[PDB]
Design a protein around this ligand. Structure first.
Ligand SMILES: Cc1cc2nc3c(=O)[nH]c(=O)nc-3n(C[C@H](O)[C@H](O)[C@H](O)CO)c2cc1C
Ligand SMILES: Cc1cc2nc3c(=O)[nH]c(=O)nc-3n(C[C@H](O)[C@H](O)[C@H](O)CO)c2cc1C
Ligand SMILES: Cc1cc2nc3c(=O)[nH]c(=O)nc-3n(C[C@H](O)[C@H](O)[C@H](O)CO)c2cc1C
Ligand SMILES: Cc1cc2nc3c(=O)[nH]c(=O)nc-3n(C[C@H](O)[C@H](O)[C@H](O)CO)c2cc1C
Ligand SMILES: Cc1cc2nc3c(=O)[nH]c(=O)nc-3n(C[C@H](O)[C@H](O)[C@H](O)CO)c2cc1C
Lengths: 146, 146, 146, 146, 146
């Protein structure tokens, strides 16, 4: 699968930048090197945290045109019930933005119990980088949408 | 119940292809052999994973016309809360696509604790193939929609 | 409360027909014998399972005109998480169909732990038939809608 | 805060009339005696149970015009999962009706473990009547909407 | 990041004023002193409780024009299931108001187990004031929306 003409959007939160950078990297790397996506055709915006992910994406979708978008963020279970309610709302929200707009939104949200689980899924400490998978999913959904 | 004229869509994810193939097979087999559905009248698309099921279906529904569609995928509980939030969002999303479009969407999503439970419901190891049930449900809902 | 002119719809699933029949019976019986609903003014459709309840109702609401509708089905906790996610989606969906259409939808969905609990609520083994209650609720909501 | 011109709607379910009456009383009493709401400007409808609360309100909102509405009902945990799914759907539904219509909907739904907890929140056995609070909330939201 | 021209709205509930005031303070303080927001450009409304947060915001968004809004409130787990259902509905609702309007809504809702956890997140007893974070998030989302 190659998408030389595909325009892709990547909105990521800023908390847990240690797990987030590897995630974004893998996504970009994979699209460029495996699906022939052009670097200039990849916009990368950012928002304070995961809560702003759905709106950040919705705003950008209104401005320019993209074939696919990837929402990236990591939520870690804390002492309160915050984790549970935000996770549910954000996941439901990304799903909504995608269905409302007709633009494929790939879920790059990690909802873990601790930092280790997040880093592991970002490719560190012997884990597999899930950003790569999201990159290929973006490309694939982008093409099927044409 | 026979649906010789029915056009049916089947979108399935690709993770856990071991449980997914049997599922799709049973669905197709059942429609052809028990409800007289014509093989040429059955489109089979695929997406990376369960998260893309709702959008994959919505896109296809916009292109061609179908009397019913079956969303197939299997989610397995992992170490994080991922399983819980995606399961809820995907199920809610397939329900939405169906009600929004007026096209019957049959739920072929397995949300299990482990691989064994999935294979069991795919007809292996003495279990009953649920794909068969989904096939008959598609045919029935398709006819009642006419 | 009497509704001689009321037209009522009853869509029921087919799994657990042992608990479902008593449920439907009580609903019909109650409407006829206590609220003067005319037998000819009661349509009874059916769908494979509870998942199709929302769409089955939405389709029918589009065809003919009804003053109230009753969605009947029984979900039993199983080995997987299926029970939990379907229950939530179906209940949320019936609520949606009702609010979207303006037509009162009475919830006749039983979400139990085992078969016994269902039969008990269907009037068997010393229990009270909840179908009766749903019948009266349909009639009442139908009238208040006029 | 005084609302002599405010028109307020109160829809309440009928199950657990022992806890419900005190609740409604407190709401009305409080509005009349503390916010100068006129008794003639307070409509009080009723529905069979909590499930019908959202639709009962939506129907009335379509007929007449109100500045605020209070949904009152009490759900008690039972032997099945019924309590959990209905509670979630009803709460989500009242929230929806309010946001869809632009009319403030005050939540007067009690979701308790047992009858005692409900009566306690209805002002009995040394508890505080929450109906009073809902009455003041209705008045306040009604005014801010003008 | 500076937003001298930004107009920001802050709607807060009134229960737990001990935790709420510090929260609002930190938000305002941070915007003024770190992002050059003008005090006259910050409206501060209030509602009885967290349930009214979504509607309170929706009403105000309809009146005047803002670049961002912050919903502040604190919910504390009690004896009943109330906490759980309201938390979920309010969080889902704030998310909806934001996506429906196109106006960024920052979540300043604390869903804690006890009063201590709330005060801690309000900057007291050695904790970090989260109002500051919400203030910066509002400013940032406000600018990116232009
Ligand atoms: C107590 C608390 C914990 C938070 N934890 C996270 C987290 O783990 N990941 C994340 O992206 N954002 C987190 N956020 C920020 C949240 O996503 C959101 O951006 C804010 O509530 C709105 O700015 C947290 C906010 C608060 C108040
Ligand atoms: C940590 C993790 C676990 C996943 N588990 C599953 C699974 O069990 N089944 C499935 O269809 N997709 C799974 N997916 C992929 C998911 O459905 C979805 O496709 C992606 O998040 C978007 O490409 C998983 C993704 C991640 C990051
Ligand atoms: C594993 C499994 C368990 C099911 N259990 C029920 C049940 O208890 N009640 C019911 O009405 N339908 C049940 N269904 C069918 C479901 O409501 C729905 O009809 C299908 O997924 C779509 O045809 C089940 C389906 C599956 C695959
Ligand atoms: C098994 C069962 C338990 C119920 N429990 C309550 C309850 O505690 N409170 C209430 O207002 N309604 C209750 N209802 C009725 C429900 O709100 C709703 O009105 C019906 O399902 C639709 O008429 C119950 C209905 C059933 C079938
Ligand atoms: C039993 C009960 C507990 C409540 N607890 C809270 C709370 O912890 N925080 C809050 O902002 N509002 C709380 N509220 C009020 C709620 O947010 C809402 O304003 C009302 O139900 C509508 O006025 C509570 C209301 C009730 C009846």
């Amino acid at each position: 699968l190659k998408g030389p003409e595909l325009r892709i959007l990547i909105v990521h939160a800023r908390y847990n930048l240690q797990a987030i950078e590897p995630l974004v990297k893998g996504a970009v790397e994979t699209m460029i090197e495996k699906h022939d996506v052009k670097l200039e055709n990849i916009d990368i915006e950012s928002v304070p945290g995961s809560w702003e992910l759905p709106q950040g994406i919705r705003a950008s979708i209104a401005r320019n045109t993209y074939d696919a978008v990837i929402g990236i963020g990591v939520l870690i279970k804390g002492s309160t019930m915050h984790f549970e309610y935000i996770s549910e709302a954000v996941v439901h929200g990304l799903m909504r933005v995608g269905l409302d707009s007709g633009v494929p939104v790939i879920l790059g949200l990690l909802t873990v119990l601790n930092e280790e689980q997040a880093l592991y899924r970002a490719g560190l400490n012997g884990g597999h980088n899930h950003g790569n998978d999201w990159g290929s999913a973006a490309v694939e959904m982008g093409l099927k949408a044409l």
